[PDB]
Symmetry: none
Subunit: 128 residues, 2 copies
Amino acid sequence: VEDPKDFPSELLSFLSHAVFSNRTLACFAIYTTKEKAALLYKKIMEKYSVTFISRHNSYNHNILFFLTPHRHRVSAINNYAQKLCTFSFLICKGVNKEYLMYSALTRDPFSVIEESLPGGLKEHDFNP
Amino acid sequence: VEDPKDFPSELLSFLSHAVFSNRTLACFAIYTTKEKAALLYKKIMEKYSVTFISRHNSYNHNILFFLTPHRHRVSAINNYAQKFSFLICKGVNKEYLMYSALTRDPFSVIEESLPGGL
């Protein structure tokens, strides 16, 4: 067993795969170890003043999903993540299907561990 | 060709770009077609008791700008507007600059709720 080279297949359809793109987004997701996830959970929340950020169980690892106040290039959300994150796999990408990504993160095979707004988000709150 | 994805780059600075927020505001702006813009001018005026609302010529399309006496979630405004043409609804952070820009070439006003605007 090596480390994931990308997010689980189930989610791939809701994410952008141009991690080098110059496009900017406000929704992001990170695939990394449990311990790092929990740490990036507090860090990212502060760093980008997230409007929402959730941590999810994902096959022995974790997935952070978060919404930002401003727009950024997946490029800079990755540099920051990596910075404080050696010796640990870390996969970062922008989300195109915001609601779909999160909602899927609340259902099997996934499940929430914690989230900035207990209660979670509903589809109509999104302004894609 | 696909419909627009954002407001004209020349205005992005004055706007809020969260696709998810619990922040409420009293100034919004909609980027859609000329016909939809017209419908909405009246509809939006009534629905949110705007204190001021203006509709400007963008290029092929139109941009609607208004201020509210009370605050709402951009999402709530958007949900209302959506109910087939493209439509982009967003909060405005720098209200004056935003309305000012919409009154200069390229842009111009078609109709506003206050003679002279701002």
